Amino acid sequence: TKQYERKAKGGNLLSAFELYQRNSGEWFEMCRDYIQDGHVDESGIFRPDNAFYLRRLTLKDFRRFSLLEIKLEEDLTVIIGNNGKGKTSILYAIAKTLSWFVANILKEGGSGQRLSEMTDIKNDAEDRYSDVSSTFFFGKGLKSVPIRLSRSALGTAERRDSEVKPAKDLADIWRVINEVNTINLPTFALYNVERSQPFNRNIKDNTGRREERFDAYSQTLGGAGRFDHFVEWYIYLHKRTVSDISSSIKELEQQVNDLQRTVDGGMVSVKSLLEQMKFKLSEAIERNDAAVSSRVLTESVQKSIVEKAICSVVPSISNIWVEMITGSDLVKVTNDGHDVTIDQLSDGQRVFLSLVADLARRMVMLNPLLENPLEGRGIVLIDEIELHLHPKWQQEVILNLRSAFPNIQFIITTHSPIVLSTIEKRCIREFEPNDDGDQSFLDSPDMQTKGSENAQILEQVMNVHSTPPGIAESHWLGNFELLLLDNSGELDNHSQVLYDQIKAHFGIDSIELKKADSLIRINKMKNKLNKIRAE
Amino acid sequence: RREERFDAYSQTLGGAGRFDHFVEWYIYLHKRTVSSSIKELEQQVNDLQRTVVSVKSLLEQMKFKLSEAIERNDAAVSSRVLTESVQKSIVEKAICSVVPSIS
Amino acid sequence: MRELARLERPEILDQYIAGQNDWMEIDQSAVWPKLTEMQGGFCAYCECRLNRCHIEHFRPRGKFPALTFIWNNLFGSCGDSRKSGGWSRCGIYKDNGAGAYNADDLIKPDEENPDDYLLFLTTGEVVPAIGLTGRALKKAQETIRVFNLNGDIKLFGSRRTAVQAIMPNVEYLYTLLEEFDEDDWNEMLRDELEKIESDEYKTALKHAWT
Numbered sequence: 073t074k075q076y077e078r079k080a081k082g083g084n085l086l087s088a089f090e091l092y093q094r095n096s097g098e099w100f101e102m103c104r105d106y107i108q109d110g111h112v113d114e115s116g117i118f119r120p121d122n123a124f125y126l127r128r129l130t131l132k133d134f135r136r137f138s139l140l141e142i143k144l145e146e147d148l149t150v151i152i153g154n155n156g157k158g159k160t161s162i163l164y165a166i167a168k169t170l171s172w173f174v175a176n177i178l179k180e181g182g183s184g185q186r187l188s189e190m191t192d193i194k195n196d197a198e199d200r201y202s203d204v205s206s207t208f209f210f211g212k213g214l215k216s217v218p219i220r221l222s223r224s225a226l227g228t229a230e231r232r233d234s235e236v237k238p239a240k241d242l243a244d245i246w247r248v249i250n251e252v253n254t255i256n257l258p259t260f261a262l263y264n265v266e267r268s269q270p271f272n273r274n275i276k277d278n279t280g281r282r283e284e285r286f287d288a289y290s291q292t293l294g295g296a297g298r299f300d301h302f303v304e305w306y307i308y309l310h311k312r313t314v315s316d317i318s319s320s321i322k323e324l325e326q327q328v329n330d331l332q333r334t335v336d337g338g339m340v341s342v343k344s345l346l347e348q349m350k351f352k353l354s355e356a357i358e359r360n361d362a363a364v365s366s367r368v369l370t371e372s373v374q375k376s377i378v379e380k381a382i383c384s385v386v387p388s389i390s391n392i393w394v395e396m397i398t399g400s401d402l403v404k405v406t407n408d409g410h411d412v413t414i415d416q417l418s419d420g421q422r423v424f425l426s427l428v429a430d431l432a433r434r435m436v437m438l439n440p441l442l443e444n445p446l447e448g449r450g451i452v453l454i455d456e457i458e459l460h461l462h463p464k465w466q467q468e469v470i471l472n473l474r475s476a477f478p479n480i481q482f483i484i485t486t487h488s489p490i491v492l493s494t495i496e497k498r499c500i501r502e503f504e505p506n507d508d509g510d511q512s513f514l515d516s517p518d519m520q521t522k523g524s525e526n527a528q529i530l531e532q533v534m535n536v537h538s539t540p541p542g543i544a545e546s547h548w549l550g551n552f553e554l555l556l557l558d559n560s561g562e563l564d565n566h567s568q569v570l571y572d573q574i575k576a577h578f579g580i581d582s583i584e585l586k587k588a589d590s591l592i593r594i595n596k597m598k599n600k601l602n603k604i605r606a607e
Numbered sequence: 608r609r610e611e612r613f614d615a616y617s618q619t620l621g622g623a624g625r626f627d628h629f630v631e632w633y634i635y636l637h638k639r640t641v642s643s644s645i646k647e648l649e650q651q652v653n654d655l656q657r658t659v660v661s662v663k664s665l666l667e668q669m670k671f672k673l674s675e676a677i678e679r680n681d682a683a684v685s686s687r688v689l690t691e692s693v694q695k696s697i698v699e700k701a702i703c704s705v706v707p708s709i710s
Numbered sequence: 711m712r713e714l715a716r717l718e719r720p721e722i723l724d725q726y727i728a729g730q731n732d733w734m735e736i737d738q739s740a741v742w743p744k745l746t747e748m749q750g751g752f753c754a755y756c757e758c759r760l761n762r763c764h765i766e767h768f769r770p771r772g773k774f775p776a777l778t779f780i781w782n783n784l785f786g787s788c789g790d791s792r793k794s795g796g797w798s799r800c801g802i803y804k805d806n807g808a809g810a811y812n813a814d815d816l817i818k819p820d821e822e823n824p825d826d827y828l829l830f831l832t833t834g835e836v837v838p839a840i841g842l843t844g845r846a847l848k849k850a851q852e853t854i855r856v857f858n859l860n861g862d863i864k865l866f867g868s869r870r871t872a873v874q875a876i877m878p879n880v881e882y883l884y885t886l887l888e889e890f891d892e893d894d895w896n897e898m899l900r901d902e903l904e905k906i907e908s909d910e911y912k913t914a915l916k917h918a919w920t
């Protein structure tokens with residue numbers, strides 16, 4: 073109608089799409105441009121004009137939470153807290169909501185994942201239902217996409233229905249526009265602690281489902297990724313890069329031509345073989361055309377992008393390649409300067425490799441039209457980012473991830489002060505230590521964490537003392553100071569004994585002893601001042 | 608899920624009469640029937656909660672009884688059911704009456 | 711690093727001659743007491759307390775076999791290859807870790823004063839001193855690089871920790887400039903600088919006090 077036309081011309085995406093659906097060119101192009109338009113930043117990074125991110129989350133009577141409201145950052149949000157505070161619960165809630173987008177991108181009227189009646193309802197909920205309410209943002213044209221997942225407990229006084237239509241409507245736009253003309257699609261992924269798992273060497277190259285674009289959405293929100301799928305896909309890419317398809321077509325074309333000449337020469341016995349070869353040729357051309365038709369990055373380029381991503385983000389890995397050892401295809405890595413198999417990698421290296429490889433695979437598959445497919449949009453959830461990482465790696469992990477995937481919204485959980493030392497306080501959401509499940513609003517810490525000392529973060533943010541309280545020696549310097557202050561700054565028999573104990577235990581060049589020495593010197597000087605003033 | 612009256616029609620015309628289902632069901636009924644106004648029960652639960660270490664087991668049993676009473680109260684007229692203790696007794700009698708050499 | 715007062719040549723270096731003799735032959739317990747007199751049980755290059763230690767040739771024995779039993783070339787460095795591998799500063803790093811270097815553009819602490827070239831910031835870094843250009847800058851920058859005086863985290867961490875421990879005492883003394891007269895205050899600063907001869911990382915502690 074005229075009203076929809078006005079709103080659509082005003083930049084409203086839903087109105088433009090509704091006009092497209094009713095008339096089924098201009099409206100299609102508007103929708104496509106809304107999704108596809110962007111610019112390259114001063115840093116050379118592609119930036120979509122219309123960003124997609126989760127803005128807000130509300131939990132009512134969900135697991136431990138009676139009521140919780142969270143505002144999320146467009147780029148990076150880190151959730152911190154003690155064990156059992158519900159950090160994982162928050163990520164799971166988001167993942168279930170995202171499942172509704174994924175389901176409807178794949179299939180019209182596809183159903184996402186529902187809340188569990190057994191586990192997701194708070195144990196002492198008076199209303200005996202749970203709600204997960206989420207609000208998404210998609211550019212100025214679609215400032216609010218509200219979604220609610222609801223589940224009622226078993227005793228069932230009244231049914232509370234989920235409200236998922238907005239998710240479906242938006243996902244429909246992606247699906248339908250993509251069907252007509254290929255567009256870049258958002259990546260959704262959850263990496264929970266289940267990402268840590270043993271590598272099966274037995275690479276069952278299935279048939280060829282791993283080459284399909286929407287295999288990128290297969291098991292995206294399952295928590296583990298599919299590192300096996302990566303390996304299969306990567307070997308596939310390698311085999312195709314070593315063998316050009318057009319030469320095979322040219323060779324097949326030549327074979328078909330030679331066989332046709334033989335059939336024309338009176339050898340009717342080879343007619344069956346000619347028909348088979350013509351079929352093979354047609355299939356090869358179709359694959360080539362489909363590849364051509366899909367406007368897709370060449371297999372060589374895809375391989376290179378992923379390899380670069382892995383080597384950039386994973387510090388111990390300088391190179392990754394496919395060997396043809398004996399018969400079977402093996403993925404090899406240069407790890408700490410040595411060529412090894414994936415099964416020879418440490419668990420920490422493998423787990424992190426798996427995360428990055430999986431994510432890169434999905435991004436390459438979902439963003440074929442971008443010069444750099446890793447500059448695509450999406451929302452990625454990572455539980456316990458520091459899982460298996462040495463402190464040195466914890467200092468680099470967030471920087472490396474954000475550099476490699478500049479337009480992904482990362483929502484992460486951590487226990488690591490070292491990780492927090494690399495992040496701005498605005499990105500941090502902390503639970504209060506004494507939270508008995510009634511804290512309405514997660515909040516930013518008071519201290520700036522980025523560039524701060526680890527010891528300060530431990531004390532001021534994580535509420536942990538710099539020295540272990542259950543060790544007697546942890547108290548000695550404090551006690552020594554108290555003794556000095558009690559005896560007007562003079563080193564008495566008791567202070568001397570403790571000093572000697574500190575010296576004996578920690579050593580002559582220990583920090584503790586130097587601090588003790590400092591205390592003696594300052595107290596002596598203070599006393600000298602006091603005497604001069606008294607006289 | 609709990610039991611409900613029309614589960615009696617589930618797999619009635621193929622898949623009925625499987626030993627394992629019986630044993631599981633029977634043990635379940637036994638556990639529930641080992642060891643009554645809602646307001647009175649609510650009052651008893653409240654009194655027991657105020658007392659609460661040795662009475663904790665009794666409190667949990669009474670909370671279960673209260674929940675069951677509320678559920679029965681909340682449950683619809685169409686899905687009216689005999690107590691688990693009665694159900695157990697009837698099945699035991701049926702088995703002992705019908706099955707050769709089981710007393 | 712400190713400016714070191716080299717004094718007298720020990721008697722055992724008279725006997726052994728370059729070409730014929732090797733450093734494996736000479737006794738090392740003969741040489742130490744004069745270096746311990748020179749340096750004061752502290753490293754020549756970083757000023758840690760010596761415990762694991764070795765006699766270091768400033769110009770190495772491979773490249774310069776002339777300067778093998780010469781008293782000016784010898785220094786007490788920290789670290790000891792014989793006991794435990796993987797030491798990453800001073801004598802051991804100059805050989806192994808630091809790649810190519812010109813030996814001429816390094817601070818030899820017996821000859822030159824380090825204080826003109828090096829500055830010790832209380833945040834823990836060693837840097838070139840304010841206003842060096844060309845050649846003097848190159849010596850300062852290469853002494854820092856070749857002895858790994860920042861790049862060793864153990865050293866950097868130990869040095870920062872020590873300076874940061876005394877910075878209450880530095881701020882408190884300079885407040886009492888006003889109330890005290892000059893003879894009282896100059897006696898106090900003399901007394902604090904008296905202590906730090908016996909202390910680890912003395913040049914870094916000096917720059918904090920003065």
Ligand SMILES: Nc1ncnc2c1ncn2[C@@H]1O[C@H](COP(=O)(O)OP(=O)(O)O)[C@@H](O)[C@H]1O
Binds near residue numbers: 157161190193
């Ligand atoms: N249905 C529920 N009702 C009440 N509390 C629950 C429920 N499910 C889990 N919890 C509480 O939630 C905590 C687990 O939350 P979780 O997200 O795993 O914490 P973490 O921040 O350590 O990942 C447990 O300590 C438990 O008491």
Ligand SMILES: [Zn+2]
Binds near residue numbers: 801
């Ligand atoms: Zn040294």
